Amino acid sequence: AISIKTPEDIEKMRVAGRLAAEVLEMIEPYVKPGVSTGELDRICNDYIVNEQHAVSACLGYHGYPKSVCISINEVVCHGIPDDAKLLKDGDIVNIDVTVIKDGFHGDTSKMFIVGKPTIMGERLCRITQESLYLALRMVKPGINLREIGAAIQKFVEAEGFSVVREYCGHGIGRGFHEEPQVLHYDSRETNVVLKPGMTFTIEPMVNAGKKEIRTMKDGWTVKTKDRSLSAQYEHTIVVTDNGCEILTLRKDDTIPAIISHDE
Ligand SMILES: COC(=O)[C@@H](CC(C)C)NC(=O)[C@H](C)NC(=O)[C@@H](O)[C@H](N)c1ccc(C(C)C)cc1
Ligand SMILES: [Co+2]
Ligand SMILES: [Co+2]
Ligand code: NA
């Protein structure tokens, strides 16, 4: 019973998606060795509230205490900004942003590499983004979400990496999380034929080591069980009549905003 957005709803999601992307573009010059993740989160929240006139969807959500999630190295997701935690040379860092504007959500994340990359960190981030991009190139009416999940997993595993099972992409709109689930791996349970006007995220988490994860005792932070590096990228999109439109595109993305499968 999946939600179909109107043209007017989609325009509001273009606005909210642009805002979420713009948080990531804004924060970039601050993501440097020696900065604290607590400071990055304050910069983001101040920007969202005071400049964008929007709200963070994460703040207070199930009690989450901060405005963005900042996940470093072996942290898979839900890293909590902390004034004591300083970024350092070689770190891979996900910043995941969700804003609400005019009732609609925009949800996106990217990796930043701090200082001189490690070769493995760079490779892991690259393959993770590539897995998102290959999925985006498949989105069009009539395709099944199952085909997309299977393709992400095939691609990632061929690189000797693994796909986290637990924290899938999602429908999004007036609600933060809506149907459907967007799995990043193959499942016989998945049977969702895309229709124009569906809006959802794709947000693969890819581990350099094994797929298993662990939640820390703080009740939020998720790490790889084997302490291998983990990376994630996320975009919010709308299914169009012949493809998709990426609502959270940034200037540094290297895929077109509008992907068309028509002749
Ligand atoms: C089983 O846990 C989950 O799947 C939950 C955790 C919440 C609902 C408690 N959902 C997620 O992690 C989803 C898949 N994450 C997402 O949709 C992320 O793109 C989104 N930017 C986000 C990040 C953090 C949180 C929590 C920590 C406040 C919520 C939402
Ligand atoms: Co997100
Ligand atoms: Co999301
Ligand atoms: Na990580």
Paired with 236 in beta bridges are: 201
Ligand 1: nearest atom to the Cα of 61: 28
Angle at 152 between CA 148 and CA 158, to 5 degrees: 145
Phi first, then psi, for residue 137 (nearest 5°) are: -65, -15
Neighbours of 115 (CB within 10 A): 13
> Is the CB of 56 inside a 6 Å radius of any atom of ligand 1?
no
Looking from the CA of 155 toward its CB, the CA atoms found within 13 Å total 21
Pocket test for ligand 1, best of 56, 98, 168, 234 (most atoms within 8 A of CB): 98
H or E segment at 108?
A: strand 104-113
- Ligand-binding annotation for 98, yes or no, is yes
Experimental method: X-ray
The domain over range 1-263 is classified in CATH as 3.90.230.10: yes
Q: Are 98 and 176 in contact (CB under 8 A)?
A: yes
Distance from chain centroid for Cα 183:
13
Q: Is 7 exposed, middle or buried (0-12, 13-18, 19+ CB in 10 A)?
A: exposed
